[PDB]
Every structure is written in C-alpha cells, then in structure tokens.
Amino acid sequence: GSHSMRYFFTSVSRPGRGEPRFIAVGYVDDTQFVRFDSDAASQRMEPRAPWIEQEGPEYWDGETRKVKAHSQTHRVDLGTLRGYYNQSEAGSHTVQRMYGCDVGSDWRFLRGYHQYAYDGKDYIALKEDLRSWTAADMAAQTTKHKWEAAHVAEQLRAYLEGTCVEWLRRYLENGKETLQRTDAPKTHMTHHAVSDHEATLRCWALSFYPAEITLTWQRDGEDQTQDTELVETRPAGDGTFQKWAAVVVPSGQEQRYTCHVQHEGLPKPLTLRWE
Amino acid sequence: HMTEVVRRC
Amino acid sequence: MIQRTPKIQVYSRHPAENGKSNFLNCYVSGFHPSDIEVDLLKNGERIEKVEHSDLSFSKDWSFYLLYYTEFTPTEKDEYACRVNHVTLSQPKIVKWDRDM
C-alpha cells in the first residue's frame, strides 16, 4: 500500500510551575517508534519500536540535539503567541506541530505536511505545493511574513520531498517484519436483547493491523445507518487495533442484517450475519 | 528522522 | 481557545477469560486541552501500577492516551475508569462490560 511518517509535538505552558511540558512522538503508519518527554529522566530521544535500535549513536545524538531544539523553539513560541494574542501570563496555553510525508505503493513521494496549532485551532500550515503558507487568522500573518523572509518553505520542502521519504523507506526495510505485516481482523457478532421488542447486534473487528478499517451495516443488501453505533478505532496495547459497530433491530428480524468488513487484510470483504 | 527546521513563530 | 470533552472506552487487550492474565485499557480521545486525569479502579479502589502511552493527537488536533494495567479478571471483581478534565463538571466513571 501507501505509507507515512509523522511527528507530533505538544508544548504546554505552566505559569509559576516552571518550564513548558514538551512531548514529541514519531510514527511510521500506525506504529510509534520514537519519543521524548521533557519531564522524563533521560533527557534523550528514546526508541519505542525494536527496529529503530538498529540505528547507531550518531542517530540518537542527532535526534536528541534536534528534539531539544524543537522544544527550545516551542518554549519561545508560547511567549511570542501570548503577545500576538494579548493574553495574560496566568493561563495555560498549548502549541502543537505536526509534519511528515506520504508515499504510495511505489514508495515515491505523494504528499507532505507541516502545520501549527495554538490552543486547539490552526495557527499556520504549509500549503500542499510546499511553497507557501496559509495563516488561519491575522496574527498568523506576522509569522508567515517572518518565514517567507528566512526561506523556511524551501528548507522544509527539501525535507519533505527528500530526507523524509528516504528515511521513511529505510525504516520500512529495517522493520519489514512489523511495518510491512498485515494482520486481518479476527471477526465475530454478538446478540443482546434490549427488551421483548428490540435487540442489539454488535459486529467486532479485533487484532488487526494497520488501523484503517471500515465497518458498515446492511439491511437486505442496502446500506443502513439509522439506529447504528460506531466506536472510534482503539488500540489493544500490543500494536494491534480494535473497533465495533452495533445496530438496534426489531426482535424477529435479525436475519435481514449483515455486517460488512473491509481491511487490507481481507482480499475479499467479509460478510457477517447472525443468521 | 526529524527536520533541522526549528524556526520561531 | 477551543475546548473538547474526551470520549472514554474501557476494555481488555485480549478476549477476557476468568483466571487468564490480561490488560485492562482506558482509551481517552478527542479532548483538548491535554491535562487530564485517568485512574483505573478495582471494586471502586484505585489501582496503583498503571502505565499510559506518550501523548499524541489527531488531524483535528484533539489529544488521545492509552491507560493500561496488568490484571487477572474474575466473576466477582468489578472494574471502572475514572476521568476528569476541565470540560467535565465532575469526574466521569465508566464501568467495564464483559460482552459490550
């Protein structure tokens, strides 16, 4: 299929309670491989997947140097943003940054991203051409002008079109046994009576990888959305994912209902019926 | 592999 | 400043069988800001040895976290997860449910 690398950075100011909390996290597709916690003991970038341990000291020394520089810039931004927004020093505020690259089946560059959020909302992102900026508001115009001046787009494009994808590839090779697996869902249905009149059918997908999956109910061969319930795909905690969907049906009518499961692990989509 | 770019807002 | 209330799901890592060691999960998502308070409960008593994931977030910028602990379930023992967040008027409690 297609693959991606993503980094996720969060800084949270804590007034009078010291310096900002900073958490950084690295991902290939749906597998976390790297992390930094400003409040952990190591003060180093740390591995979170087996295959990244194949990397030598220069890598760990290069990543730590970088993640610390990212933290330093988020420390400055929390202060700067406060000015741009004319906020007091009493409250807590959040800076978020996300970036990385997507490759298609041929592992070549499809798309790159680089976006910033202040207190829960878009602040500034890089447009899909990776050559200009979209400022979400008037305050972000000040930032956009500074980064246009310092040629940041061009430096980020070089990253997103080359370095990102080169290293994305390398990860995929190095961790082939995990990153390139497919675990097909283990599926089953359950039945629970709400009263004499109604029952809940629940279609389960368990232990699948990657996380992308569809579950859809049908009644007599047609899409059914009314009186259904879908949870967010959740992690199992062993690197696999789980998800379920439910429908409330009239007692005696169960058989009309099918549950349909698409996943990269299912060449042919599964149909489950209670019967 | 993170980027070198850490420009300030 | 945009604030969102977390979703809560309580569940196990593997299908639960009595006398088989497992993991109890409390997955909280779609919330902002990041500060949150999750505790796992055994018969209303706070478990001690409780690990959680490294904070990350989604396309919409809301946070998510996996709280987990080893345990061996039984007929008697009830489990819940306790969550508190600036968007809650009071801490929410969600019981684990074996079938659903």
mmCIF file of C-alpha atoms in Angstrom:
data_model
loop_
_atom_site.group_PDB
_atom_site.id
_atom_site.type_symbol
_atom_site.label_atom_id
_atom_site.label_comp_id
_atom_site.label_asym_id
_atom_site.label_seq_id
_atom_site.Cartn_x
_atom_site.Cartn_y
_atom_site.Cartn_z
ATOM 1 C CA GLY A 1 0.000 0.000 0.000
ATOM 2 C CA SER A 2 0.924 3.541 0.830
ATOM 3 C CA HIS A 3 2.928 4.516 3.927
ATOM 4 C CA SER A 4 3.700 7.575 6.014
ATOM 5 C CA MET A 5 5.964 9.103 8.646
ATOM 6 C CA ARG A 6 4.579 11.624 11.135
ATOM 7 C CA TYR A 7 5.979 13.656 14.055
ATOM 8 C CA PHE A 8 3.708 15.111 16.828
ATOM 9 C CA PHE A 9 4.943 17.860 19.175
ATOM 10 C CA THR A 10 2.991 19.389 22.069
ATOM 11 C CA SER A 11 4.220 22.217 24.367
ATOM 12 C CA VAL A 12 2.022 23.295 27.342
ATOM 13 C CA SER A 13 2.935 26.405 29.408
ATOM 14 C CA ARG A 14 2.547 26.059 33.193
ATOM 15 C CA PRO A 15 2.684 29.508 34.873
ATOM 16 C CA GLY A 16 4.692 29.647 38.127
ATOM 17 C CA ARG A 17 5.116 25.863 37.884
ATOM 18 C CA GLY A 18 8.401 26.004 35.947
ATOM 19 C CA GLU A 19 9.191 25.470 32.225
ATOM 20 C CA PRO A 20 6.816 24.151 29.481
ATOM 21 C CA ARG A 21 5.910 20.458 29.378
ATOM 22 C CA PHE A 22 7.103 19.184 25.920
ATOM 23 C CA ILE A 23 6.233 15.783 24.427
ATOM 24 C CA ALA A 24 7.432 14.670 20.974
ATOM 25 C CA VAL A 25 6.415 11.489 19.201
ATOM 26 C CA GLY A 26 7.439 9.720 15.964
ATOM 27 C CA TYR A 27 5.260 7.384 13.853
ATOM 28 C CA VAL A 28 5.523 5.178 10.835
ATOM 29 C CA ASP A 29 1.955 4.486 9.679
ATOM 30 C CA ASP A 30 0.248 3.322 12.845
ATOM 31 C CA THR A 31 3.410 2.200 14.839
ATOM 32 C CA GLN A 32 5.154 4.595 17.265
ATOM 33 C CA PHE A 33 8.947 4.352 17.064
ATOM 34 C CA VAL A 34 10.363 7.323 18.994
ATOM 35 C CA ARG A 35 9.540 9.681 21.887
ATOM 36 C CA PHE A 36 10.866 12.485 24.043
ATOM 37 C CA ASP A 37 9.370 13.661 27.404
ATOM 38 C CA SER A 38 10.791 16.909 28.857
ATOM 39 C CA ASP A 39 9.895 15.612 32.348
ATOM 40 C CA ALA A 40 11.493 12.133 31.986
ATOM 41 C CA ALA A 41 14.915 11.397 33.452
ATOM 42 C CA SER A 42 16.934 10.648 30.320
ATOM 43 C CA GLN A 43 16.616 13.943 28.589
ATOM 44 C CA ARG A 44 17.247 11.855 25.399
ATOM 45 C CA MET A 45 15.214 10.844 22.377
ATOM 46 C CA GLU A 46 14.172 7.253 23.195
ATOM 47 C CA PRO A 47 13.258 4.217 20.972
ATOM 48 C CA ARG A 48 9.739 2.743 21.181
ATOM 49 C CA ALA A 49 9.957 0.134 18.440
ATOM 50 C CA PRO A 50 12.533 -2.736 18.258
ATOM 51 C CA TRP A 51 13.688 -1.944 14.690
ATOM 52 C CA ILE A 52 14.854 1.618 15.462
ATOM 53 C CA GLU A 53 17.541 0.168 17.762
ATOM 54 C CA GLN A 54 19.426 -0.797 14.532
ATOM 55 C CA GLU A 55 20.377 2.950 14.499
ATOM 56 C CA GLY A 56 23.780 3.962 15.843
ATOM 57 C CA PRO A 57 24.897 6.562 18.444
ATOM 58 C CA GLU A 58 25.115 9.398 15.825
ATOM 59 C CA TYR A 59 21.436 8.969 15.131
ATOM 60 C CA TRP A 60 20.495 9.139 18.834
ATOM 61 C CA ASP A 61 22.837 12.077 19.281
ATOM 62 C CA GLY A 62 21.410 13.810 16.189
ATOM 63 C CA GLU A 63 17.722 13.220 17.210
ATOM 64 C CA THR A 64 18.271 14.387 20.791
ATOM 65 C CA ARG A 65 20.061 17.556 19.547
ATOM 66 C CA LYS A 66 17.023 18.193 17.227
ATOM 67 C CA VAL A 67 14.169 17.326 19.633
ATOM 68 C CA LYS A 68 15.750 19.658 22.196
ATOM 69 C CA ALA A 69 15.985 22.443 19.568
ATOM 70 C CA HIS A 70 12.272 21.862 18.795
ATOM 71 C CA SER A 71 11.494 22.193 22.482
ATOM 72 C CA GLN A 72 13.530 25.370 22.742
ATOM 73 C CA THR A 73 11.551 26.925 19.833
ATOM 74 C CA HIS A 74 8.175 25.925 21.399
ATOM 75 C CA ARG A 75 9.318 27.479 24.626
ATOM 76 C CA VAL A 76 9.930 30.712 22.726
ATOM 77 C CA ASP A 77 6.701 30.480 20.700
ATOM 78 C CA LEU A 78 4.442 30.138 23.843
ATOM 79 C CA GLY A 79 5.747 33.541 24.959
ATOM 80 C CA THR A 80 5.531 35.015 21.434
ATOM 81 C CA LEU A 81 1.960 33.756 20.825
ATOM 82 C CA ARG A 82 0.894 35.245 24.189
ATOM 83 C CA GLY A 83 1.960 38.701 22.894
ATOM 84 C CA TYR A 84 0.368 38.170 19.472
ATOM 85 C CA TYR A 85 -2.923 37.333 21.183
ATOM 86 C CA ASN A 86 -2.611 39.876 24.063
ATOM 87 C CA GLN A 87 -3.103 37.178 26.718
ATOM 88 C CA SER A 88 -2.164 37.279 30.435
ATOM 89 C CA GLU A 89 0.623 35.158 31.997
ATOM 90 C CA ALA A 90 -1.802 33.373 34.319
ATOM 91 C CA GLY A 91 -3.408 30.860 31.977
ATOM 92 C CA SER A 92 -2.067 27.675 30.417
ATOM 93 C CA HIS A 93 -1.676 27.521 26.597
ATOM 94 C CA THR A 94 -0.724 24.820 24.051
ATOM 95 C CA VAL A 95 1.468 24.838 20.886
ATOM 96 C CA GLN A 96 1.209 21.830 18.555
ATOM 97 C CA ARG A 97 3.236 20.992 15.487
ATOM 98 C CA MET A 98 2.877 18.045 13.083
ATOM 99 C CA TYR A 99 4.885 17.171 9.980
ATOM 100 C CA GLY A 100 5.902 14.294 7.692
ATOM 101 C CA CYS A 101 5.428 12.628 4.266
ATOM 102 C CA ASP A 102 3.214 10.102 2.439
ATOM 103 C CA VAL A 103 4.457 7.634 -0.134
ATOM 104 C CA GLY A 104 2.342 5.478 -2.432
ATOM 105 C CA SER A 105 2.635 1.762 -3.298
ATOM 106 C CA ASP A 106 5.782 2.508 -5.280
ATOM 107 C CA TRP A 107 7.236 4.203 -2.160
ATOM 108 C CA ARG A 108 7.565 7.539 -4.042
ATOM 109 C CA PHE A 109 6.585 10.940 -2.752
ATOM 110 C CA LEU A 110 2.835 11.623 -2.830
ATOM 111 C CA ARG A 111 2.364 14.415 -0.283
ATOM 112 C CA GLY A 112 3.981 16.325 2.601
ATOM 113 C CA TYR A 113 2.581 18.338 5.515
ATOM 114 C CA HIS A 114 3.753 20.855 8.166
ATOM 115 C CA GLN A 115 1.106 22.515 10.398
ATOM 116 C CA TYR A 116 0.952 24.505 13.700
ATOM 117 C CA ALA A 117 -1.909 24.943 16.159
ATOM 118 C CA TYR A 118 -2.289 27.410 19.069
ATOM 119 C CA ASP A 119 -4.726 26.420 21.890
ATOM 120 C CA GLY A 120 -6.701 23.874 19.834
ATOM 121 C CA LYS A 121 -7.009 25.643 16.469
ATOM 122 C CA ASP A 122 -4.975 26.083 13.293
ATOM 123 C CA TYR A 123 -2.347 28.722 13.561
ATOM 124 C CA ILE A 124 -0.220 28.367 10.268
ATOM 125 C CA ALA A 125 0.276 25.453 7.853
ATOM 126 C CA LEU A 126 2.304 24.812 4.669
ATOM 127 C CA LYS A 127 0.097 24.558 1.536
ATOM 128 C CA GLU A 128 0.149 21.327 -0.483
ATOM 129 C CA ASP A 129 2.569 22.835 -3.036
ATOM 130 C CA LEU A 130 5.070 23.115 -0.099
ATOM 131 C CA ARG A 131 5.995 26.631 -1.311
ATOM 132 C CA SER A 132 3.616 28.945 0.522
ATOM 133 C CA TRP A 133 1.802 29.342 3.832
ATOM 134 C CA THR A 134 -1.830 29.615 4.935
ATOM 135 C CA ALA A 135 -2.232 31.861 8.036
ATOM 136 C CA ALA A 136 -5.511 30.921 9.789
ATOM 137 C CA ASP A 137 -6.037 34.487 11.103
ATOM 138 C CA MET A 138 -4.490 37.979 11.191
ATOM 139 C CA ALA A 139 -1.977 37.155 13.977
ATOM 140 C CA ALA A 140 -0.505 34.301 11.972
ATOM 141 C CA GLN A 141 0.318 36.869 9.236
ATOM 142 C CA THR A 142 3.211 38.077 11.336
ATOM 143 C CA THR A 143 4.696 34.548 11.392
ATOM 144 C CA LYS A 144 4.119 33.888 7.710
ATOM 145 C CA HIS A 145 5.969 37.100 6.858
ATOM 146 C CA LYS A 146 8.985 36.044 9.022
ATOM 147 C CA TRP A 147 9.247 32.527 7.497
ATOM 148 C CA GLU A 148 8.806 33.947 3.961
ATOM 149 C CA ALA A 149 11.796 36.216 4.768
ATOM 150 C CA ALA A 150 14.007 33.401 6.044
ATOM 151 C CA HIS A 151 13.131 30.981 3.200
ATOM 152 C CA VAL A 152 11.722 28.316 5.553
ATOM 153 C CA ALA A 153 9.358 26.805 2.989
ATOM 154 C CA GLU A 154 12.229 25.845 0.696
ATOM 155 C CA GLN A 155 14.160 24.199 3.536
ATOM 156 C CA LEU A 156 11.019 22.258 4.630
ATOM 157 C CA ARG A 157 10.263 21.128 1.047
ATOM 158 C CA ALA A 158 13.761 19.715 0.674
ATOM 159 C CA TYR A 159 12.958 17.809 3.930
ATOM 160 C CA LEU A 160 9.505 16.673 2.930
ATOM 161 C CA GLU A 161 10.331 15.592 -0.628
ATOM 162 C CA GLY A 162 13.747 14.019 0.011
ATOM 163 C CA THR A 163 15.025 13.409 3.556
ATOM 164 C CA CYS A 164 11.614 12.433 4.868
ATOM 165 C CA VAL A 165 10.886 9.871 2.257
ATOM 166 C CA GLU A 166 14.437 8.497 2.112
ATOM 167 C CA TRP A 167 14.293 7.779 5.835
ATOM 168 C CA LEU A 168 10.691 6.547 5.577
ATOM 169 C CA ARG A 169 11.896 3.948 3.085
ATOM 170 C CA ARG A 170 14.856 2.940 5.257
ATOM 171 C CA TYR A 171 12.506 2.386 8.232
ATOM 172 C CA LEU A 172 10.242 0.160 6.130
ATOM 173 C CA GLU A 173 13.138 -2.013 5.027
ATOM 174 C CA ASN A 174 14.694 -2.123 8.518
ATOM 175 C CA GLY A 175 11.407 -3.003 10.253
ATOM 176 C CA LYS A 176 9.926 -5.024 7.408
ATOM 177 C CA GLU A 177 8.795 -7.837 9.759
ATOM 178 C CA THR A 178 6.468 -5.422 11.643
ATOM 179 C CA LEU A 179 5.791 -2.353 9.459
ATOM 180 C CA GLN A 180 5.042 -4.387 6.347
ATOM 181 C CA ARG A 181 2.787 -7.014 8.012
ATOM 182 C CA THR A 182 -0.928 -7.247 7.623
ATOM 183 C CA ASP A 183 -2.983 -8.666 10.484
ATOM 184 C CA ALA A 184 -6.569 -9.326 9.148
ATOM 185 C CA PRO A 185 -9.333 -8.723 11.753
ATOM 186 C CA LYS A 186 -10.500 -11.634 13.828
ATOM 187 C CA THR A 187 -14.269 -11.066 13.447
ATOM 188 C CA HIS A 188 -17.491 -12.229 15.169
ATOM 189 C CA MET A 189 -21.046 -10.975 16.001
ATOM 190 C CA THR A 190 -22.855 -10.734 19.365
ATOM 191 C CA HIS A 191 -26.522 -10.507 20.330
ATOM 192 C CA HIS A 192 -28.020 -8.721 23.363
ATOM 193 C CA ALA A 193 -31.716 -8.170 23.990
ATOM 194 C CA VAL A 194 -32.811 -4.641 24.981
ATOM 195 C CA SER A 195 -36.444 -5.697 25.662
ATOM 196 C CA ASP A 196 -39.081 -8.002 24.156
ATOM 197 C CA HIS A 197 -39.131 -5.763 21.087
ATOM 198 C CA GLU A 198 -35.559 -4.863 20.221
ATOM 199 C CA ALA A 199 -32.097 -6.385 20.033
ATOM 200 C CA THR A 200 -28.541 -5.018 19.553
ATOM 201 C CA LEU A 201 -26.252 -6.693 17.048
ATOM 202 C CA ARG A 202 -22.547 -5.892 17.515
ATOM 203 C CA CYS A 203 -20.005 -6.641 14.826
ATOM 204 C CA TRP A 204 -16.444 -6.819 16.204
ATOM 205 C CA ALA A 205 -13.085 -6.424 14.417
ATOM 206 C CA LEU A 206 -10.148 -7.399 16.673
ATOM 207 C CA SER A 207 -6.367 -7.713 16.418
ATOM 208 C CA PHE A 208 -5.976 -6.051 13.050
ATOM 209 C CA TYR A 209 -3.084 -4.050 11.541
ATOM 210 C CA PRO A 210 -2.849 -1.432 10.204
ATOM 211 C CA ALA A 211 -5.610 0.608 11.904
ATOM 212 C CA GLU A 212 -7.561 1.702 8.786
ATOM 213 C CA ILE A 213 -10.741 -0.384 8.554
ATOM 214 C CA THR A 214 -14.381 0.009 7.506
ATOM 215 C CA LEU A 215 -17.408 -1.484 9.219
ATOM 216 C CA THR A 216 -20.848 -0.924 7.638
ATOM 217 C CA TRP A 217 -24.278 -2.416 8.363
ATOM 218 C CA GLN A 218 -26.653 -3.532 5.598
ATOM 219 C CA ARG A 219 -30.330 -4.418 5.734
ATOM 220 C CA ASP A 220 -31.464 -6.712 2.895
ATOM 221 C CA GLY A 221 -28.482 -5.656 0.763
ATOM 222 C CA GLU A 222 -28.907 -1.900 1.282
ATOM 223 C CA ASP A 223 -26.775 0.461 3.424
ATOM 224 C CA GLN A 224 -28.234 1.046 6.874
ATOM 225 C CA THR A 225 -27.128 3.938 9.082
ATOM 226 C CA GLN A 226 -30.246 4.570 11.198
ATOM 227 C CA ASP A 227 -30.139 3.027 14.708
ATOM 228 C CA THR A 228 -26.443 2.160 14.340
ATOM 229 C CA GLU A 229 -23.454 2.927 16.550
ATOM 230 C CA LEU A 230 -19.758 3.040 15.616
ATOM 231 C CA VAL A 231 -16.901 3.487 18.105
ATOM 232 C CA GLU A 232 -13.560 5.076 17.310
ATOM 233 C CA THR A 233 -10.889 2.568 16.367
ATOM 234 C CA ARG A 234 -8.985 1.991 19.621
ATOM 235 C CA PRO A 235 -5.510 0.476 20.400
ATOM 236 C CA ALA A 236 -5.251 -3.075 22.046
ATOM 237 C CA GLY A 237 -1.837 -2.191 23.546
ATOM 238 C CA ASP A 238 0.094 -4.897 21.689
ATOM 239 C CA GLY A 239 0.381 -2.946 18.406
ATOM 240 C CA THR A 240 -2.994 -4.197 17.027
ATOM 241 C CA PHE A 241 -6.304 -2.287 16.905
ATOM 242 C CA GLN A 242 -9.963 -2.941 17.749
ATOM 243 C CA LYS A 243 -13.339 -1.478 16.618
ATOM 244 C CA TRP A 244 -17.031 -2.421 16.693
ATOM 245 C CA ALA A 245 -20.357 -1.318 15.196
ATOM 246 C CA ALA A 246 -23.884 -2.005 16.507
ATOM 247 C CA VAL A 247 -27.430 -1.819 15.177
ATOM 248 C CA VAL A 248 -30.738 -1.927 17.012
ATOM 249 C CA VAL A 249 -33.140 -4.184 15.137
ATOM 250 C CA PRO A 250 -36.769 -5.368 15.643
ATOM 251 C CA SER A 251 -36.935 -8.691 17.532
ATOM 252 C CA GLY A 252 -37.508 -11.486 14.996
ATOM 253 C CA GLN A 253 -35.764 -9.556 12.119
ATOM 254 C CA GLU A 254 -32.078 -10.255 12.870
ATOM 255 C CA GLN A 255 -31.580 -12.278 9.713
ATOM 256 C CA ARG A 256 -32.185 -9.337 7.396
ATOM 257 C CA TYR A 257 -28.976 -7.760 8.752
ATOM 258 C CA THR A 258 -25.414 -8.139 7.531
ATOM 259 C CA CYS A 259 -22.179 -6.626 8.800
ATOM 260 C CA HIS A 260 -19.539 -5.808 6.136
ATOM 261 C CA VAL A 261 -15.805 -5.533 6.964
ATOM 262 C CA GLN A 262 -13.154 -4.087 4.579
ATOM 263 C CA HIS A 263 -9.480 -4.162 5.516
ATOM 264 C CA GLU A 264 -6.171 -4.575 3.660
ATOM 265 C CA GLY A 265 -6.034 -7.990 5.336
ATOM 266 C CA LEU A 266 -9.217 -9.098 3.601
ATOM 267 C CA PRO A 267 -8.617 -9.642 -0.177
ATOM 268 C CA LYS A 268 -12.373 -10.223 -0.263
ATOM 269 C CA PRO A 269 -14.510 -8.168 2.190
ATOM 270 C CA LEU A 270 -16.220 -10.232 4.902
ATOM 271 C CA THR A 271 -19.962 -10.534 5.352
ATOM 272 C CA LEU A 272 -21.215 -11.483 8.814
ATOM 273 C CA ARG A 273 -24.853 -12.395 9.509
ATOM 274 C CA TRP A 274 -26.287 -13.511 12.811
ATOM 275 C CA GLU A 275 -28.458 -15.858 10.646
ATOM 276 C CA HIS B 1 14.388 11.456 11.282
ATOM 277 C CA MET B 2 13.278 14.969 12.270
ATOM 278 C CA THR B 3 13.835 18.063 10.171
ATOM 279 C CA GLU B 4 16.500 20.665 11.056
ATOM 280 C CA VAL B 5 13.978 23.438 10.690
ATOM 281 C CA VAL B 6 13.060 24.932 14.053
ATOM 282 C CA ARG B 7 12.185 28.497 13.034
ATOM 283 C CA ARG B 8 10.416 30.697 15.668
ATOM 284 C CA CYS B 9 6.774 31.874 15.112
ATOM 285 C CA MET C 1 -9.111 28.601 22.913
ATOM 286 C CA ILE C 2 -11.164 25.622 21.760
ATOM 287 C CA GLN C 3 -12.087 23.016 24.331
ATOM 288 C CA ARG C 4 -13.316 19.470 23.718
ATOM 289 C CA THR C 5 -14.607 16.771 26.090
ATOM 290 C CA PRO C 6 -12.906 13.324 25.945
ATOM 291 C CA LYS C 7 -14.517 10.093 24.750
ATOM 292 C CA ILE C 8 -13.979 7.154 27.051
ATOM 293 C CA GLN C 9 -13.681 3.487 26.217
ATOM 294 C CA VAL C 10 -12.941 0.771 28.878
ATOM 295 C CA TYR C 11 -11.984 -2.703 27.569
ATOM 296 C CA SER C 12 -9.393 -5.513 27.616
ATOM 297 C CA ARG C 13 -6.387 -6.198 25.388
ATOM 298 C CA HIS C 14 -7.429 -9.837 24.644
ATOM 299 C CA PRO C 15 -10.843 -11.626 24.966
ATOM 300 C CA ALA C 16 -11.330 -11.927 28.745
ATOM 301 C CA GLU C 17 -11.289 -15.374 30.344
ATOM 302 C CA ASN C 18 -11.549 -15.880 34.122
ATOM 303 C CA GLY C 19 -8.129 -16.744 35.541
ATOM 304 C CA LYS C 20 -6.287 -15.626 32.410
ATOM 305 C CA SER C 21 -3.916 -12.709 32.811
ATOM 306 C CA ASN C 22 -4.759 -9.754 30.532
ATOM 307 C CA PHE C 23 -4.592 -5.961 30.169
ATOM 308 C CA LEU C 24 -7.310 -3.527 31.252
ATOM 309 C CA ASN C 25 -7.466 -0.477 28.892
ATOM 310 C CA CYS C 26 -8.840 3.024 29.325
ATOM 311 C CA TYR C 27 -8.607 4.836 25.980
ATOM 312 C CA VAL C 28 -9.420 8.556 26.099
ATOM 313 C CA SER C 29 -9.636 10.597 22.862
ATOM 314 C CA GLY C 30 -10.821 13.767 21.072
ATOM 315 C CA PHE C 31 -10.131 16.034 24.078
ATOM 316 C CA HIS C 32 -8.390 19.379 24.477
ATOM 317 C CA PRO C 33 -6.542 20.661 26.364
ATOM 318 C CA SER C 34 -4.051 17.895 27.178
ATOM 319 C CA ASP C 35 -4.189 17.839 31.025
ATOM 320 C CA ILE C 36 -6.444 15.045 32.018
ATOM 321 C CA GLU C 37 -6.899 12.691 34.928
ATOM 322 C CA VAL C 38 -7.362 8.994 34.382
ATOM 323 C CA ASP C 39 -7.387 6.279 37.103
ATOM 324 C CA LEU C 40 -8.243 2.592 36.818
ATOM 325 C CA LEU C 41 -10.470 1.218 39.563
ATOM 326 C CA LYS C 42 -10.854 -2.219 41.127
ATOM 327 C CA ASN C 43 -14.133 -2.550 43.041
ATOM 328 C CA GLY C 44 -14.072 1.284 43.343
ATOM 329 C CA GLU C 45 -10.447 1.246 44.597
ATOM 330 C CA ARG C 46 -7.671 2.962 42.608
ATOM 331 C CA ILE C 47 -5.105 0.538 41.128
ATOM 332 C CA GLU C 48 -1.520 1.558 41.679
ATOM 333 C CA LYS C 49 0.709 0.147 38.921
ATOM 334 C CA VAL C 50 -0.823 1.946 35.922
ATOM 335 C CA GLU C 51 1.115 2.857 32.754
ATOM 336 C CA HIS C 52 -0.026 5.178 29.939
ATOM 337 C CA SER C 53 1.029 5.996 26.368
ATOM 338 C CA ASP C 54 3.028 9.032 25.202
ATOM 339 C CA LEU C 55 0.681 11.893 24.394
ATOM 340 C CA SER C 56 -0.241 12.286 20.700
ATOM 341 C CA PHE C 57 -3.081 13.919 18.765
ATOM 342 C CA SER C 58 -5.296 13.599 15.623
ATOM 343 C CA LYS C 59 -5.992 15.553 12.393
ATOM 344 C CA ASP C 60 -8.298 17.806 14.341
ATOM 345 C CA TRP C 61 -5.600 18.463 16.979
ATOM 346 C CA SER C 62 -7.520 16.655 19.802
ATOM 347 C CA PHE C 63 -5.391 14.508 22.228
ATOM 348 C CA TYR C 64 -5.520 10.736 22.919
ATOM 349 C CA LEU C 65 -3.961 8.449 25.591
ATOM 350 C CA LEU C 66 -3.935 4.788 26.457
ATOM 351 C CA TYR C 67 -4.079 3.998 30.196
ATOM 352 C CA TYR C 68 -3.318 0.286 30.912
ATOM 353 C CA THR C 69 -2.540 -2.225 33.711
ATOM 354 C CA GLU C 70 -1.936 -5.942 34.070
ATOM 355 C CA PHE C 71 -4.727 -7.916 35.751
ATOM 356 C CA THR C 72 -6.350 -11.351 36.010
ATOM 357 C CA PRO C 73 -10.179 -10.899 35.898
ATOM 358 C CA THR C 74 -12.736 -12.956 37.939
ATOM 359 C CA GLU C 75 -16.515 -13.412 38.451
ATOM 360 C CA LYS C 76 -16.614 -11.101 41.483
ATOM 361 C CA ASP C 77 -14.305 -8.175 40.651
ATOM 362 C CA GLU C 78 -15.758 -5.067 39.006
ATOM 363 C CA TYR C 79 -13.574 -2.588 37.126
ATOM 364 C CA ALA C 80 -14.045 1.039 36.111
ATOM 365 C CA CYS C 81 -12.109 4.001 34.726
ATOM 366 C CA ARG C 82 -12.262 7.491 36.298
ATOM 367 C CA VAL C 83 -11.696 10.596 34.159
ATOM 368 C CA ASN C 84 -11.523 14.281 34.995
ATOM 369 C CA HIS C 85 -10.972 17.145 32.543
ATOM 370 C CA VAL C 86 -11.628 20.917 32.600
ATOM 371 C CA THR C 87 -14.598 20.220 30.308
ATOM 372 C CA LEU C 88 -16.234 17.949 32.902
ATOM 373 C CA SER C 89 -18.395 19.439 35.657
ATOM 374 C CA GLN C 90 -17.431 16.423 37.744
ATOM 375 C CA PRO C 91 -15.238 13.319 37.238
ATOM 376 C CA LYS C 92 -16.848 10.731 34.974
ATOM 377 C CA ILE C 93 -16.850 6.976 35.766
ATOM 378 C CA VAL C 94 -17.291 4.265 33.113
ATOM 379 C CA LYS C 95 -17.578 0.569 34.152
ATOM 380 C CA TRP C 96 -16.007 -2.216 32.047
ATOM 381 C CA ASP C 97 -18.595 -4.502 30.400
ATOM 382 C CA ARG C 98 -17.605 -8.042 29.502
ATOM 383 C CA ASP C 99 -19.753 -8.528 26.376
ATOM 384 C CA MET C 100 -20.004 -4.929 25.076
#
